Structure formats: C-alpha cells, structure tokens
C-alpha cells in the first residue's frame, strides 16, 4: 500500500517542485515514477537518480519516495504516479501504483492586459459569448453559482511561434439580463480590466 | 517500442447487457493487466495474467472476468454491467509482472446507463473574434462551444484550411453541466484558438471546430422520436474577414 497526496499542487513556472509518496512494505525495492497527461495512458518517466530537470530519490529506511522537478514548465502539468514492486528474485513482485498527485505549473504572463470581450456566433442567432483573457496567472475565475450562467475555468494557450502564452475563461448564458459587463462579477478581476464598448 | 491497443475506446451500454473490451499488444509480452481509474482512487487492478492460460484476480475483480488464450490478447468481460462499472479502464503489458516497464493502452471510457433515453450528440458553434480584441492586441481569438451532449464522450479539435492545428489552442480539461438542476445533465465544453490579426483578416482562411462524439452503435435499439445519437462528427465553421 502507497500513500500519495492528490494535490492539486499549484506552482509558478521556474519553481522547483517536489512530489512524493510513502509506503509500508519493506520488500519494495524497485521505484519508478509515471506521468499521466489529461486522461491519457500513464507512461514511465523515472525507474533513476538524475535525468536533466528530474531527480528521483528513495529513502528505504523512511519508506519515502520523491521526485523533484527543477525549473518547472507549464508543460509539466500532469498527474504523477509513484510505482513500485519487489525484486524479480521474489515469488511475487507485482508492480503497484500510488493514486497520483496532480501538478499545475502556472504560466509566467509577462505583459498582462486583462480584458473581457464579446464574441458573436458565426452562424447568427443572437448568440454570443464573453471571453475574459490576458490576465496574469494569479487570477482566479469563479463559478458564479447561478444555474443559468455558465463559466469555464481558466485555460492557458500557447502561441509557440510568438513566444506568447495567455490565459482565458469563457462565460455564456441565455438570461436576458446577461452582459459581458456583469459576466465575471462573481470573480475578483483586475481594476484595469478592459471592457470595450 | 510498440504499443497496447484497446477496443473500443468509448462505449455506452444499458445495465445488464454483456460486453467485452479487448486489449492487444504485439510485443509478445507475457504479463498483461486490467485496471480501472476513478476520481480519488487512482488505478485499481481488476485482474492480471502472468502468461497464456494464466489469470488471477486483482484487488477489485467483482463483476469482471478475463481470458488469456493467446499472448497477444487479454479481454475484459462484464457479464452483467452495473452503473458503478462506469469508469475509465486501462490495460497494461510488460515483459514480467514487475521490476520492469509497464506499457499502458489509451483507456476505454465505459458508461453504463439504466437506459439510453438521455444520450444526445453535441451541437457545435464557433464564435468569431472581437474587433475590439483585434484592435487592442493584434491577435484574434475564436471560441468553440460544444453543447447539449451526454455522456461526456467527446474529442474536440481545430482545423485551419483543412488541417488540424494544436498551436494557440486550449480546450477545457472537463465539460461542465448545462442543466445540473436536472438528472443526467447534458454537458458543454469550450475551446479557444488564437491566431494573429493578419491571419484572421484573410477571407481565404477557413476555421473549423470539429467535435467527435462517441454514442450508440448500429445495433443499439432506438425508439425516441429524434435521430438516433450514434457516433458522429459535428462541426461549426467560420471564414476570415477583412473587417
């Protein structure tokens, strides 16, 4: 049996992160880390000592496993699973996985320009959405907790060839009183947020 | 380097109707294993097979059986699916039961429903960039919304001039419920694609938000008035604008 904290652990890009697990079985002698993106299949990361930005370590006396990620990047954001088993000289040595820790690395937004823009449907309908965008990663987007208004959480996109990342969230509603002006009233947003006319 | 495949990758079934999910690997590995993954519980092993004609219960076998007639395959069989078997299943293979790399398949998402009345494909709409964003930033963000679908079995992608794009995209990691006040709320999911103003401005550029929905199969019986919610793609599109 393996104990692992679920997180999520949120850190700023460039920070060192430490992920760890504790186990109770002294026959465990092989220790690896797996990384799982979104809902995709886990894939081995470390089974080692150091590997570039990664160092895996084990203290068998403390029964404590750790993975350190130096200079962390938004692309490290994933679930990390510690895996372990006995030796192959053992009668049974089935690999087991801890239940994973979710890591979010917050992108460093170098020039925030928070704004709420209204976008209209391409097809027509009187339908529109409200896009809050370009805010720094300190910003939290709240679910407004009104049943007829829908608000996504923040999501970071990367325009690789501009060396530009930006956060955004989307809100929409059918309530006749809904307007981009009020859409994110349930969140704390920068006073300088731009509401075009 | 090769791989583990699972079939199907998505499946809806009514309670009590038998189904099997295949897992196959072409590496001649002796050891294969089935797990489920559920929120809060991580991977839990259902059953494992050390070699051809050798199978063994794992930690959560109830409701499942397997077989291992050949090295290539290790199917998971649910004789009488129950709702709490709704889950994400992963097959894995390795040269041996441990102290060695396990290779995982891509996952099979299974939803087991009381009936199929609440299954619905997405509707899809593309919202065009704000002229205010273009003038303020010299960039242009399109938003796609997929709405009304259930269960949450979708894959959203963007296609610019007929080719898939990944740069400048981000899609919500999970949908939200549209009518969380009702049972079996249909779901909505949003994604953004951001391009330069120059690129959006060209009327020859064509942008499509494509949602693959995995729904009922040919064989599933359908008796509601509306079109059967089969596996299908639903898209919406926008062209660039000089504006």
Residue numbers in the entry:
A (entry chain A): 3 to 49, 55 to 204
B (entry chain B): 1 to 243
What does the paper say about this structure?
Several TCRs have been isolated from TILs of epithelial cancer patients that recognize a neoepitope corresponding to residues 168–176 of p53R175H. This neoepitope includes the arginine-to-histidine mutation at position 175 (HMTEVVRHC). The TCRs are restricted by the common MHC class I allele HLA-A*02:01. The structures reveal how oligoclonal TCRs 12-6, 38-10, and 1a2 discriminate between wild-type and mutated p53, and demonstrate that there are multiple distinct solutions to recognizing the p53R175H neoepitope with sufficient affinity to mediate tumor cell killing.
To assess ligand-induced conformational changes in the TCRs, we determined the structures of 12-6 and 1a2 in unbound form to 2.36 and 1.83 Å resolution, respectively (TCR 38-10 did not crystallize). Ligand-induced conformational changes were also observed in the CDR3 loops of 1a2. CDR3β underwent a rearrangement (r.m.s.d. in α-carbon positions of 1.8 Å for residues 96–102) that resulted in formation of four hydrogen bonds and 33 van der Waals contacts with P7 Arg and P8 His at the critical C-terminus of p53R175H. CDR3α experienced a considerably larger movement (r.m.s.d. of 5.5 Å in α-carbon positions for residues 93–102), with CDR3α Glu96 undergoing an α-carbon displacement of 11.5 Å. This rearrangement allowed CDR3α to form a β-hairpin whose tip engages the HLA-A2 α1 helix and p53R175H, thereby optimizing TCR interactions with both MHC and peptide.
